[PDB]
Amino acid sequence: LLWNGPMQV
Amino acid sequence: GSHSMRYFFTSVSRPGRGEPRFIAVGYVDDTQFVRFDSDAASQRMEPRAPWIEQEGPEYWDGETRKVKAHSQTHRVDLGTLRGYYNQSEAGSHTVQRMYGCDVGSDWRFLRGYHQYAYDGKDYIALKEDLRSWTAADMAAQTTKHKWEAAHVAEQLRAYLEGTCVEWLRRYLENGKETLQRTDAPKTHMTHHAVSDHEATLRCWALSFYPAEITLTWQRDGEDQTQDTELVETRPAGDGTFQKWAAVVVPSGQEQRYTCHVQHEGLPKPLTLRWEP
């Protein structure tokens, strides 16, 4: 299952 | 014993050629189970192992939404990083991301990781404690401060210690027929005269899973790593791996050399010796 929370650098 | 789930993401900018390439792949141990490719027709998360095909349309709609949010994040990031390094719009650049979780033989959380690379080098990584970041340079400190302000580490840690290990367990149960297997290497030795004074011994490991293996030559019980020709472990293409290791020996002295095979699938390490 993917992480739903990636954030812009 | 130990298992892992990993997701790998690549984004390549295309100068003067529009949207960046984006490729996402998911692995349980050494087995790919999903993918997304921006160049593919579906524009959906697609299955790549039989046991994930039984997940319902809610799973696929959800993985599609989340992979596209990853795509959008990488899209912005390539623009942000070109800014941070003041690079020209003329050149192609690469972002790579890897995250995942390890469980032990008890299927309990052992470790989690999140690494991010720009143009083939570490940019920012989650530290082992999953509470802070290591930033490679002055540009990455900007990112580090943004991720501290937005408490990314806390929400990333809840995923790596919670969701990640729970869905890994689900996949290990649903995929038991193939994921829980360890295939011991099938081994053999070949012997080829080079001249009247020298000969090549080659030790083969075939049809092993997982990919992790050691092949080592000893002479009189002593390591030979200076004179060993070794190839990198390679995929057979059917879910198993291959490797060989070769040594050039004096004719008549073949019985001094032993090939040592270590693999998770072996009760105990093998020693092989050439006998005519």
Partner: protein
């Protein structure tokens, strides 16, 4: 920018046997950046019906890919892998050695 030249292995899925269905593999690894051209050749002519793995990378961030084609080895036919990448001033051809 780091540039890493590809490592190339050309091999069969199964031990090669004349007249028996098999897979020819070209495994390209250790390379950066990701843009790479791979062709399997039969007697110097490109084989169209070639599949490839989804682009992935190792712990040093270098990429790897598997290209593969279904084939039947005969005593006459020569197979090779042709690879092009920004690190190569011209395509590298690597011959399939049957016993390897």
């Amino acid at each position: 920018m780091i540039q890493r030249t590809p490592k190339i292995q050309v091999y069969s899925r199964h031990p090669a046997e004349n007249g028996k269905s098999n897979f020819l593999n070209c495994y390209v690894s250790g390379f950066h950046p990701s843009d790479i051209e791979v062709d399997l050749l039969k007697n110097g002519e490109r084989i169209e019906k070639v599949e490839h793995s989804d682009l992935s990378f190792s712990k040093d961030w270098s990429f790897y890919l598997l290209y593969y084609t279904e084939f039947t080895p005969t005593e006459k036919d020569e197979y090779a892998c042709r690879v092009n990448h920004v690190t190569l001033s011209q395509p590298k051809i690597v011959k399939w050695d049957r016993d390897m």
